[PDB]
Enzyme design. Structure first.
Site, PDB file in Angstrom:
ATOM      1  N   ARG A  64      -0.036   9.201   0.164  1.00  0.00           N
ATOM      2  CA  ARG A  64      -0.856   9.348   1.415  1.00  0.00           C
ATOM      3  C   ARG A  64      -0.253   8.585   2.601  1.00  0.00           C
ATOM      4  NH1 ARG A  64      -3.537   4.376   0.385  1.00  0.00           N
ATOM      5  NH2 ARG A  64      -3.793   4.801  -1.901  1.00  0.00           N
ATOM      6  N   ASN A  65       0.518   7.542   2.310  1.00  0.00           N
ATOM      7  CA  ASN A  65       1.162   6.738   3.331  1.00  0.00           C
ATOM      8  C   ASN A  65       2.637   7.010   3.565  1.00  0.00           C
ATOM      9  OD1 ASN A  65      -1.169   5.433   3.957  1.00  0.00           O
ATOM     10  ND2 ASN A  65      -0.856   3.852   2.375  1.00  0.00           N
ATOM     11  N   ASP A  81       1.964   3.200   7.426  1.00  0.00           N
ATOM     12  CA  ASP A  81       0.789   2.372   7.133  1.00  0.00           C
ATOM     13  C   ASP A  81       1.035   0.931   6.790  1.00  0.00           C
ATOM     14  OD1 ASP A  81      -2.109   1.789   5.576  1.00  0.00           O
ATOM     15  OD2 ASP A  81      -2.049   3.099   7.347  1.00  0.00           O
ATOM     16  N   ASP A 140       0.790  -1.227   0.000  1.00  0.00           N
ATOM     17  CA  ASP A 140       0.000   0.000   0.000  1.00  0.00           C
ATOM     18  C   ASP A 140       0.835   1.296   0.000  1.00  0.00           C
ATOM     19  OD1 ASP A 140      -2.325   1.481  -0.226  1.00  0.00           O
ATOM     20  OD2 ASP A 140      -2.651   1.588   1.959  1.00  0.00           O
TER      21      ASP A 140
HETATM   22  N1  LIG Z   1       2.264   9.322  13.377  1.00  0.00           N
HETATM   23  C1  LIG Z   1       1.606  10.399  12.855  1.00  0.00           C
HETATM   24  N2  LIG Z   1       2.115  11.659  12.981  1.00  0.00           N
HETATM   25  C2  LIG Z   1       1.490  12.740  12.467  1.00  0.00           C
HETATM   26  N3  LIG Z   1       0.322  12.674  11.793  1.00  0.00           N
HETATM   27  C3  LIG Z   1      -0.315  11.480  11.595  1.00  0.00           C
HETATM   28  C4  LIG Z   1       0.303  10.243  12.129  1.00  0.00           C
HETATM   29  N4  LIG Z   1      -0.525   9.226  11.791  1.00  0.00           N
HETATM   30  C5  LIG Z   1      -1.575   9.758  11.111  1.00  0.00           C
HETATM   31  N5  LIG Z   1      -1.462  11.106  10.999  1.00  0.00           N
HETATM   32  C6  LIG Z   1      -2.413  12.044  10.317  1.00  0.00           C
HETATM   33  O1  LIG Z   1      -3.802  11.640  10.399  1.00  0.00           O
HETATM   34  C7  LIG Z   1      -4.316  11.366   9.076  1.00  0.00           C
HETATM   35  C8  LIG Z   1      -5.273  10.175   9.111  1.00  0.00           C
HETATM   36  O2  LIG Z   1      -4.753   9.176   9.992  1.00  0.00           O
HETATM   37  P1  LIG Z   1      -4.291   7.734   9.423  1.00  0.00           P
HETATM   38  O3  LIG Z   1      -4.616   6.648  10.441  1.00  0.00           O
HETATM   39  O4  LIG Z   1      -2.860   7.874   8.946  1.00  0.00           O
HETATM   40  O5  LIG Z   1      -5.219   7.625   8.084  1.00  0.00           O
HETATM   41  P2  LIG Z   1      -6.481   6.643   7.745  1.00  0.00           P
HETATM   42  O6  LIG Z   1      -7.434   7.469   6.894  1.00  0.00           O
HETATM   43  O7  LIG Z   1      -7.061   5.979   9.012  1.00  0.00           O
HETATM   44  N6  LIG Z   1      -5.876   5.344   6.700  1.00  0.00           N
HETATM   45  P3  LIG Z   1      -4.165   5.001   6.348  1.00  0.00           P
HETATM   46  O8  LIG Z   1      -3.695   5.990   5.268  1.00  0.00           O
HETATM   47  O9  LIG Z   1      -4.196   3.579   5.807  1.00  0.00           O
HETATM   48  O10 LIG Z   1      -3.465   5.154   7.690  1.00  0.00           O
HETATM   49  C9  LIG Z   1      -3.061  11.137   8.216  1.00  0.00           C
HETATM   50  O11 LIG Z   1      -3.218  11.376   6.810  1.00  0.00           O
HETATM   51  C10 LIG Z   1      -2.048  12.088   8.836  1.00  0.00           C
HETATM   52  O12 LIG Z   1      -2.178  13.434   8.332  1.00  0.00           O
END
Ligand SMILES: Nc1ncnc2c1ncn2[C@@H]1O[C@H](COP(=O)(O)OP(=O)(O)NP(=O)(O)O)[C@@H](O)[C@H]1O
Length: 307
Positions: A145-146, A159, A141
């Site tokens: 975005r990841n 991710d 993946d």
């Molecule tokens: N460790 C981190 N530090 C800073 N920002 C984060 C972190 N993890 C997530 N985010 C932010 O929160 C947003 C959404 O959380 P996240 O869990 O990454 O996405 P999701 O839509 O649940 N699916 P995925 O892209 O598979 O993780 C991300 O696009 C980041 O902008």
């Protein structure tokens, strides 16, 4: 295979203040927060991810698999997993990537991002993957975005909700990002390190076009056929043939024909010594790129090692 001796750290809920919401919806809720380990007199900017309150066996099964992976990897270009917290609702604790994810960063900053950054990211993304490849691990993946931004000069792959480990993974069902997947993946659900390479190319293309949407307009259904016709994604405006040629290489049908991440590192890293030869961007040379009174004992995760 080798024994996986990574340590999984279990954190007391009392060891960490939450402070602000960052994500919310798509699966869980993500928080900016601080983590003061036991009696250490350090504070660690973290991202806390617990899951949408009400708990289902189906959900925890994944956050823990993710945690399994994230804990077993240690590279400067792969996300640092700090520990988990086993409260009613399982929390994942990771390094705060303050500037958010790379996809958002490019959109919101196109008029200030230079070839130096772009190629550096490419290089750093490649190194993350090469490393995952050494650990015999298939991301499945990779996408703009990841990849998260710790600072504009330092990105890290993230991710691991699909990450896997055998010559080719033979998946089942589930929702899949079509517009990033190799063809072998779309037609046979085969995943190798070389299908990861393909998604790399798409990620690079995402960056070079400042965060466009690949095959925007075309619906997922047609894609397999489109890529079968011999069609790939267009050449980004800012891209010298050289760079684009590397992208095209990533998207070849014979998966063994595509470059190896360790080669991608080499090629982009050459280019990254003369950025402006390989990326033509208006303004390049004239472009460049926390908030608490209490921030005395703050230490980035990357300096917070444990044996
Ligand atoms: N460790 C981190 N530090 C800073 N920002 C984060 C972190 N993890 C997530 N985010 C932010 O929160 C947003 C959404 O959380 P996240 O869990 O990454 O996405 P999701 O839509 O649940 N699916 P995925 O892209 O598979 O993780 C991300 O696009 C980041 O902008």
């Amino acid at each position: 295979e080798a024994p996986n001796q990574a340590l999984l750290r279990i954190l007391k809920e009392t060891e960490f203040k939450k402070i602000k919401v960052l994500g919310s919806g798509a699966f869980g809720t993500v928080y900016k927060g601080l983590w003061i380990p036991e009696g250490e007199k350090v504070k660690i900017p973290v991202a806390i991810k617990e899951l949408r309150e009400a708990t289902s066996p189906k959900a925890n099964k994944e956050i823990l698999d993710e945690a399994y992976v994230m804990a077993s990897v240690d590279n400067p270009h792969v996300c640092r997993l700090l520990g988990i917290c086993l409260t009613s609702t399982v929390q994942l604790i990771t390094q705060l990537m303050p500037f958010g994810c790379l996809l958002d960063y490019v959109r919101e900053h196109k008029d200030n991002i230079g070839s130096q950054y772009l190629l550096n990211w490419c290089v750093q993304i490649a190194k993350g993957m090469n490393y995952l490849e050494d650990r015999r691990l298939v991301h499945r993946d990779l996408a703009a975005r990841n990849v998260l931004v710790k600072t504009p000069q330092h990105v890290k792959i993230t991710d691991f909700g699909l990450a896997k480990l055998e010559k080719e993974y033979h998946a089942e069902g589930g929702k899949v990002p079509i517009k990033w997947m190799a063809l072998e993946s779309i037609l046979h659900r085969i995943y190798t390190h070389q299908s990861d390479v393909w998604s790399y190319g798409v990620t690079v293309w995402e960056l070079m076009t400042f965060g466009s949407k690949p095959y925007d307009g075309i619906p997922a259904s047609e894609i397999s056929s489109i890529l079968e016709k011999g069609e790939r994604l267009p050449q980004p405006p800012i891209c010298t043939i050289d760079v684009y040629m590397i992208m095209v290489k990533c998207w070849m049908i014979d998966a063994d024909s595509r470059p190896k991440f360790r080669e991608l590192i080499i090629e982009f890293s050459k280019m990254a010594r003369d950025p402006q030869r390989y990326l033509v961007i208006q303004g390049d040379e004239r472009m460049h790129l926390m908030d608490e009174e209490d921030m005395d004992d703050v230490v980035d995760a990357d300096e917070y090692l444990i044996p």
